[PDB]
Design a protein around this ligand. Structure first.
Ligand SMILES: [Cs+]
Ligand SMILES: [Cs+]
Ligand SMILES: [Cs+]
Ligand SMILES: [Cs+]
Ligand SMILES: [Cs+]
Ligand SMILES: [Cs+]
Ligand SMILES: [Cs+]
Ligand SMILES: [Cs+]
Lengths: 226, 231, 231, 226
């Protein structure tokens, strides 16, 4: 039987634009209480926004605090993701590598860490990490991006191993080419932000309870491999 | 913006019992038109049943035709294993024939109508276990994954996708008849520290049959409480 | 501290032609005692040949027995596909029977002697292609991987390991008879930007047959110039 | 036919102790010219040592320079690896996460970057990254370690995608439990440093030319999965 809906306290990081925005809007339409973080550009009409730079652990702490006061402790964390600085390995700098790692990977650790306490205590948690945006498949021109997104999957699986006994799961959505190279895609087209948002809606629902440590590709078949 | 619901013609093989039954009843409550295959015992009230042994290509043809006349051409195929329970050539070949070749038989029979109508969802249900290292069961379930990926690559241009749901340890009518020692013994290998329900599997199949699953193809979704993590 | 070399009794199925031939000649130059199966044409000078159709369990038994009398019990088994080249139930089942069930047949026949002697290396050679998304070939090669992992899990306690070598696009006698359009066309999908050689495959098999491979079991090694990267 | 031996210029980072030392000694016995980096404890008798902290990009540059003067440009890079600081996600600090990421992941980027120029120019390169030391399989107690080792695999595959056309490959050796929990291992025993070293010897040889982007588990079967 289909489990009854529960309106969850949702935080979507980088939920003001692109895929993050479509996630945020879908989760709100689903009936959840949705908050987003942003860099300054503001949150969309309707939804609760807080400014947060995910490279700053204290700014992550006060974004969560603000969210808990507004709508209750975060039950569903959607970690978008992120940045985007490419380059040939030979031309790629230490600075470019570390900034993408700090935003995309360590940033994911920061928001996950800040959520884990309350999720554990309350015996409910859904951590959903959004790859940007083509992976496991070695692309670029982007040693930094590939490293951060593969690292998020390893991180998620470690969290999943640790916290699944407490009904706190961690899963990854791996988008391919999304419209916010067609030769490599069996669907022969790019996906939409809504097509990503629907997989996140599923992972944020009562139907996803026995999924944990999973990586769900949303790429029209592009990254089939090993 | 959730895509509007579309009532699909659904066929669930081995959908009169266990996980197949939970799946068929979920897809039905979801609003789809749901038929099941069975091997004689009958389909349960509220679902159109047809008899079909998936080792038999002509039986598979007849089952699909019977379904098409009743509720229209199969738009979503759910292939539930076949044979489930634990070495000889005979044991190897029978599980392969039912689990892998049987999966090919139903997929191939579904394919022309799906390509033609520019819509198809093939959803293959792994038997309870892998993929993780059952020589026959492990071969057949690994093989269905390869088959599905091959189909996804061929047919995704025509909006015909193929995906796999890989259940871990799920509470059935035989998992319960299992020895208490192996039941708990397996709990040390599942991070969730509990068995999953047939409804927890039906849930994922509901999602893959829905309009939200359009851009997923060639995927394997584990429903195993984290058991299968690795490479 | 390289472990000292041990001359092993080796059987390479389909080892009289193409990749199987390169493998058998490498293992022989390495210093092993090498036998090959063939389907009538004969084994080449310098290798003990026996006839064996791997769809036939009794032929497999006879081949192993003939090998054991000649050079001692099989310590390293190299299972080379069978059938290679490109849909019906008949086409699906024949490739499955030769490529997957055939792999099970040779593995099962090797197993008791290996467990008993506390040494075994089973090395399964994928046909040229996957695993990447050929519905029959893709199913069978995915299936051998699952089988091998199942065997590795069962038998690794007894120093009997099972591993897979997954070749990409390799220059054979038919890859060359392929259309020039598909040869180059595939080069856009291989980071190395070139086809691999039969010797490049034999090289990996040499390593997995050696004393340096002791702690590898359940692994899949791609020899594909990076073609197969993904998940 | 077996390709003739070529004595390669080898650099093994953290080649003074444990698995790194066994790698270094095996490659030297194979007939290569082997140099190691270390933290201060010195290199072993026979082998060329240079001090290098892989968190320091300028110290990576002068270690390579010293190596090129001694024995010629580095043709085979073995990136060990690394650190080791565990903790429950809730108790894991930003500082602990970032230091393991900086040593194990960004450190791997630094040595790979510093090698890529000359390998590309000379149309030969073997980059071999050593996981420490159990992965893809979500362990711990170690979100940081899991993230760094999964990230190295994504990085390697990006390098492999970029440089394989130039005969510069990048591969990963993923050790399980090595003696420098048995319930999870089909072999029913830990491996040895030499059993790791032998896979690296193979990846550093003329037989490995058509392998690139690969992850080779050396774990007695422990991490079989997806
Ligand atoms: Cs709402
Ligand atoms: Cs709604
Ligand atoms: Cs209905
Ligand atoms: Cs309903
Ligand atoms: Cs010989
Ligand atoms: Cs030799
Ligand atoms: Cs030497
Ligand atoms: Cs030597």
């Amino acid at each position: 039987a289909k489990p009854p809906f529960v309106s969850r306290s949702v935080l979507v990081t980088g939920g003001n634009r692109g895929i993050g925005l479509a996630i945020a809007q879908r989760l709100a339409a689903d009936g959840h209480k949705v908050a987003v973080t942003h860099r300054g550009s503001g949150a969309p009409k309707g939804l609760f926004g807080v400014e947060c730079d995910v490279t700053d652990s204290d700014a992550v702490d006060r974004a969560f605090t603000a969210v808990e006061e507004h709508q209750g402790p975060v039950e569903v964390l959607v970690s978008n993701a992120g940045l985007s600085a490419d380059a040939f390995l030979m031309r790629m700098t230490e600075e470019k590598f570390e900034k993408v790692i700090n935003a995309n990977l360590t940033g994911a650790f920061r928001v996950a860490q800040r959520a884990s306490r309350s999720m554990q205590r309350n015996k409910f948690g859904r951590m959903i990490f959004i790859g940007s945006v083509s992976g496991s498949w070695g692309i670029g021109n982007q040693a930094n991006y590939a490293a951060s997104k593969a690292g998020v999957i390893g991180m998620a699986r470690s969290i999943a191993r640790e916290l699944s006994k407490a009904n706190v799961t961690a899963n990854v959505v791996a988008p391919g080419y999304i419209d916010t190279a067609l030769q490599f895609i069996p669907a022969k087209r790019v996906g939409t932000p809504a097509e990503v948002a629907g997989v996140v809606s599923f992972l944020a629902s009562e139907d996803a309870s026995y999924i944990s440590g999973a990586v769900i590709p949303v790429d029209g078949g592009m990254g089939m491999g090993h």
